[PDB]
Design a protein around this ligand. Structure first.
Ligand SMILES: [Mg+2]
Lengths: 267, 298, 402, 248, 299
């Protein structure tokens, strides 16, 4: 298939990016350090809520470092106009780049949370290996999906711009807005209104931020204190179940990939 | 009959940036599109590749549609400037393009030696010069026996030993039966290797045909200079009897601007009377013909 | 040392009631008979500067309306103004003016003594080290000292091992200690006002006592100091603007930067509905004093709310209701009085400053501001502190500012 | 003088940088938004402004001048400029004047709108103390930016490509703002038997972000030593940048 | 008075000498072409004429002075190859910047903007410029002041053939005034009509210098005489093979003779004397073939 033949390039081109391997080893040496400090103090719902915030700062960062120069980095490099004269479509050299860069994030978090589990089973004596594999299996198949959202965000902001220096400004803008501005605008809206703006609409704004849907998935079982959540304490007021919370994260991929294809179709 | 463009008048933005070009290309000729870097030449280049839609007209590449995958395996496109993938190597870039075009994987090792790049194989494209990337850009164009090359300035940033060797590699493929289109702007020198030029300007294809037709359909002076003549003062007059202005700049530097309508009697004028030293018969080059037709269009 | 019968008292009523007219007197005086003596307002009974001026040795003496001046200063021989013997049970000392360099009201071994409504101006020139005590109480059971006015004495109302007695509504201004407590089990004090004092309330080793409604206006370095108090009740106290300073003698405590409440080894006590306002430290919790009901206070305007140098967690909310914090940047979705997120008053970088004072040079760095944000993002590095689930949203002490 | 003729270029080229004008606008809003929460909610708000200008004025200086030398070598204009009547000293010092007056203007839009939000929202601010504490603030924020300007000329002249120049400009910003003080704390909280704490007021002099805060928090040395050590960080690193630029 | 007198330089980096015993003498109005590979043979000899490098075993005398004087560089234009200027600056402000550095008057900016044909695209940013649009700007800073030496390193890359012919018409206007310039180019057909004397040089040495008539005379290269239907191709192809010259019968009814250009005066007499010359093209051996010969003369 032609979708895999261009995936084998990006799987072998993203792994030679030295800026990726720096901040993907930084994700590995921090997920062990949080889990080592989480083992000497004991707690259990605090070491889950800190890993999900660690992958909130880094799995959008590795996704936006990969794919900000996916379309416009090939357009000004000349190799995009050449590629359309190969037997391909615009839907195959985009979905092929998404599978190729998606297996890197599926491997960058399998390295990160993989050694984090071995720094718990060899550190916390008497831990439940069934509960460890299930909780960190929920961390593995949902930090990819958070990564695949910001991968699909970067294909939107690469097809729209026409210069790679302006694509790096927008990719830094998307990383600042979704990670640590939308969590602070919702915080500043709740303090200044003292929770009396809307008592039923305000938990639904967590679903308009995929990092907040990511944090709500992993903190489903390990609730604990309220300040362990903080802004995520609104998620107990959401009447939606857990299975739809998986489905709105998959729907955040498919809308922002169909937007990435409809932009690229009129490039 | 490789490229049969007929009646295409491309409109976009209701501007009509190309108009009614009838560009039939034979099955062994080397055509040259010689417009500016504006919407005349590069619009018709995108039509043959199939990545543009010909409004009000039909483009038939190799007897089929221009965007079919069965004919797009038989094309080869060398673009203008391709800094390909700076972190990939040389072999892995060409093996990537070999997997896409359906070419056999044994062709990459015999194309990195056919083009002079086996010393720089398994080396990263960030460590390549501009000429080495044009060598790599040619290597994906000859991939899997292409019946239609389309080179858009292949000899920029290249040494003249490689430039003379590239046109011999072009002349190997011309005898094999592959039609080549040379969209270029380094027009002195390319006239020895092309078969038919196609000067298009302001959308309208002004002149097409071989170099003998473009000199026949445009009266241009042959530039005979006879440095080292015996007598020059009557030779100011002995050429202008048939309308050839004997203009000189030294003791004997008589650069006779002729008319190319009296070629029998002017060489007999030179060799019948007066002894020369170093004759230089300069035919009207591709710059002067292009400066006539573009000036005739405006 | 003459006696009270050696004066000229004009009897208004024949129920052992006397009335001294206006006119000066001289020397010490001694009460040996149960005489309910009153005085005209010009009865300035001025001693010469030695001895206890009005010694009382008889039970049921209603001293009223005197104006005392210039008694002794021999603190070893207890040169008081009004000395009350253990046999002088149920003495009433009502509405008196005192000015002299020794003890104002020295009682010992007494029962049901009443020191009411007096104005005891201590000194002006002595260095607050030999001024003598204002109202000294030494092991009295039943006493009722109410609504007096002590000014510029040494260590205010000293109380030593006195069991059951009330201190109601008395104003204490510009003294070393406001109210001193020594082993006063099952005591009580209501609505007292201490102003401009080097320690507002000394609570040393006294259990089971009630401290309620009291006010501390602009005192120095210690608002309420509690040492080793058990089963007490701290309800409704208003401690305002504890500025830095030093006590000048440094005997049992040291100089401080200003703490509105300093809890030292107090195990069980209910500290509710108080108001700690505009000090440098709102509350200092030592490591030995843990697990006591601290709920409903108002920690407003303090530059640092809690000082807790420990790593043990300390919940500060009994029955699901917590304290009001001025810097609580929280919301209230479900419309109750409580906030929705818990409030940690201390970071990890707020306890490195207490452990190492050289971090004050690094306290304005962005890396420190990074370290304040990583604790809010990564709670594994958060040391277990002094948080309270459900803090209050509004002021509970709407009446204490009056 | 040709040190000014190349400085007018860098003023005209620096003020049209889209990356700079985004951050310099973001610097001026956050200097108002800290001043909004310090008046409605003056040494308490001038300390939070010192932590702000320690974040962004190294970032503004490193965004301007990381591509001053190596951005001209990759553009080919550096090879052209050396064939002009120009020394290598006048190119570097002329870029330092040109990039220097940009962030000498970015604190006048930065703190010129922050001091306007203090002088008109306190109503009794006692402005005689304001115009000397902000006059000391705007001067000392330029000198912090001129250190990181001269740091950017050191890393621009050393590298040969623009991609690895931004990898060093991020590394100097991480090391001199928030890695040097975190390893100062690790020498405090983990070492006490072999760490003299009297040495630490002299070890604060090895960090220009740290010397920046010490002249906004007013200590064994006086104030005038800290002014002469911040200017020594400019003059050494510019002389270091000139020594690197002469070896291309 | 020679402009550039490269007097026996020998430039070395470590142990390798990248330019050995180069001995050039550019005249006062000559247009010289420094031809060779893109390695250190040509691009270091271009820097010694500038003030950028130093001769390790020689001296250069540009305009009778040292190459690093400020009086030299005020009358010395230099257009470098692949230049990309400050993209947020405008086209007029870049020339107004470069006129202040060279000491040129500011009234020469709008003259040179009209002269290179950049009047329509002036006051637009350099980021919205083409490749050939920047070559007009890079040429325009080289004409600033009154230059007496130009080093046009690849001036006609990405330029239209009207503008390419506009540039060489500006060169012959310039060299009549007395500005002797130096080409360092690689598109060898086209430059050969304007080069006064070529300077083809190898890896290390300087192979050949002299005019095009001197290179064709020294390097024996055969003339490419082409004809078409003199009498008959097949009856005349046989005649040169017994008489000893190679006559290629190629295209169709066409007699192409690759003659040794020592006899081609009288070789054309027999070709003229028996048939009509009605479509012939005698081509001298070009600079492309001369450079291919001198690369095989050493290497
Ligand atoms: Mg609530």
């Amino acid at each position: 298939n032609q979708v895999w033949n261009i995936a084998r390039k990006e799987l072998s081109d993203g792994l030679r990016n030295r800026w990726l391997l720096a901040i993907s080893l930084l994700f590995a040496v921090l997920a062990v350090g949080i889990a080592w400090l989480g083992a000497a103090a004991s707690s259990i719902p605090a070491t889950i809520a800190s890993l999900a915030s660690l992958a909130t700062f880094l799995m959008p960062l590795i996704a936006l470092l990969l794919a900000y120069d996916a379309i416009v980095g090939e357009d000004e490099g000349g190799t995009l106009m050449l590629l359309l004269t190969y037997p391909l479509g615009r839907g195959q050299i985009l979905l092929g780049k998404f599978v190729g860069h998606g297996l890197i994030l599926a491997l960058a978090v399998l390295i990160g949370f993989g050694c984090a589990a071995l720094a718990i089973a060899l550190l916390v004596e008497g831990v439940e290996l069934g509960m460890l594999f299930w909780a960190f299996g929920r961390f593995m198949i949902s930090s990819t999906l958070l990564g695949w959202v910001f991968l699909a965000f970067a294909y939107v902001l690469s097809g729209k711009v026409n210069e790679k220096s302006s694509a790096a400004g927008l990719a830094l803008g998307v990383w600042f807005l979704f990670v640590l501005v939308f969590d602070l605008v919702l915080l500043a809206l709740l303090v200044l209104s003292e929770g009396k703006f809307n008592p039923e609409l305000l938990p639904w704004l967590l679903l308009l931020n995929p990092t907040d849907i990511y944090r709500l998935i992993n903190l489903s079982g390990f609730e604990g204190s309220g300040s362990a959540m903080g802004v995520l304490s609104l998620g107990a007021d959401l009447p939606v179940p857990a299975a739809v919370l998986w489905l709105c994260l998959l729907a955040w991929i498919g809308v922002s990939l169909l937007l990435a294809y409809a932009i690229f179709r009129r490039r | 009959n490789a490229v049969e463009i007929q009646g295409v008048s491309q409109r976009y933005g209701s501007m009509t940036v190309l108009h009614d070009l009838n560009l039939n290309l034979g099955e062994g000729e080397v055509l040259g599109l010689f417009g500016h870097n504006g919407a005349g030449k590069t619009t018709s280049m995108k039509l043959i590749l199939g990545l543009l839609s010909p409004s009000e007209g039909q483009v038939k590449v190799l007897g089929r549609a221009p965007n079919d995958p069965q004919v797009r395996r038989q094309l080869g496109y060398l673009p203008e400037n391709v800094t390909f993938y700076p972190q990939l190597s040389g072999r892995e870039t060409l093996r990537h393009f070999a997997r896409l075009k359906g070419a056999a994987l044994t062709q990459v090792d015999e194309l990195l030696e056919q083009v002079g790049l086996a010393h720089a194989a398994d080396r990263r494209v960030k460590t390549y010069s501009k000429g080495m990337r044009q060598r790599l850009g040619l290597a994906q164009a000859l991939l899997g026996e292409p019946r239609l090359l389309l080179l858009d300035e292949p000899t920029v940033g290249l040494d003249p030993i490689a430039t003379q060797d590239l046109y011999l590699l072009i002349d190997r493929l011309r005898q094999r039966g592959t039609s080549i289109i040379l969209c270029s702007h380094v027009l002195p020198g390319v006239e020895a290797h092309i078969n038919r030029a196609a000067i298009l300007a302001k959308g309208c294809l002004q002149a097409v045909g071989s170099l003998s037709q473009l000199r026949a359909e445009a009266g241009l002076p042959v530039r005979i200079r006879a440095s080292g003549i015996s007598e020059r003062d009557s030779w100011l007059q002995r050429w202008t009897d048939a309308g050839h202005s004997a203009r000189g700049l030294s003791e004997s530097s008589i650069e006779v601007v002729a008319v190319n309508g009296h070629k029998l009697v002017l060489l007999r004028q030179l060799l019948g009377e007066g002894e020369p030293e170093d004759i230089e018969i300069h035919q009207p080059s591709l710059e002067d013909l292009y400066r006539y037709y573009m000036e005739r269009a405006g | 040392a003459p006696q009270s019968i050696t004066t000229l008292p004009l009897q208004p009523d024949g129920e052992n009631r006397w009335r001294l007219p206006a006119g000066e007197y001289q020397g010490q005086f001694t009460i040996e008979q149960p005489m309910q003596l009153r005085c005209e307002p010009g009865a300035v009974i001025q001693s010469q500067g030695q001895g206890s001026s009005l010694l009382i040795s008889a039970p049921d003496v209603l001293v009223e309306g005197c104006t005392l001046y210039e008694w002794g200063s021999d603190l070893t021989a207890m040169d008081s103004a009004v000395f009350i013997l253990p046999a002088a049970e149920r003495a009433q000392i009502s509405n008196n003016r005192m000015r002299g360099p020794g003890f104002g009201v020295f009682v010992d071994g007494t029962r049901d003594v009443q020191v009411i409504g007096n104005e005891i101006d201590g000194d002006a020139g002595v260095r607050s080290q030999d001024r003598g005590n204002g109202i000294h109480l030494f092991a009295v059971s039943g006493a009722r000292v109410l609504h007096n006015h002590v000014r510029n004495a040494r260590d205010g109302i000293y109380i030593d091992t006195s069991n059951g007695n009330h201190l109601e509504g008395n104003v204490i201004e510009d003294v070393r200690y406001g109210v001193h407590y020594m082993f006063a089990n099952e005591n009580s004090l209501i609505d007292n006002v201490t102003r401009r004092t080097r320690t507002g309330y000394a609570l040393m080793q006294s259990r089971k006592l009630t401290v309620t409604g009291n006010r501390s206006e602009q005192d120095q370095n210690y608002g309420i100091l509690m040492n080793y108090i058990t089963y007490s009740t701290i309800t409704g106290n208003f401690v305002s603007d504890v500025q830095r300073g030093d006590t000048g003698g440094d005997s049992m405590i040291s100089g401080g930067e200003g703490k509105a409440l300093f809890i030292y080894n107090s195990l069980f006590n209910t500290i509710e509905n108080n108001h700690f306002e505009k000090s440098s430290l709102g509350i200092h919790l030592t490591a030995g004093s843990e697990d006591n009901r601290i709920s409903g206070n108002a920690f407003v305007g303090n530059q640092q709310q809690v000082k807790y140098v420990a790593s043990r967690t300390q919940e500060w909310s009994v029955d699901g209701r917590g304290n009001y914090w001025s810097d609580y940047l929280g919301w209230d979705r479900n419309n109750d009085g409580l906030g929705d997120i818990a409030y940690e008053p201390n970071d990890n970088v707020d306890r490195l400053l207490w452990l190492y004072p050289q971090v004050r040079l690094l306290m304005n760095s962005p890396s420190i501001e990074v370290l304040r944000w990583v604790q809010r993002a990564f709670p594994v590095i958060k040391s277990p502190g002094v948080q309270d689930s459900h803090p209050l949203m509004k002021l509970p002490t709407e009446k204490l500012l009056t």
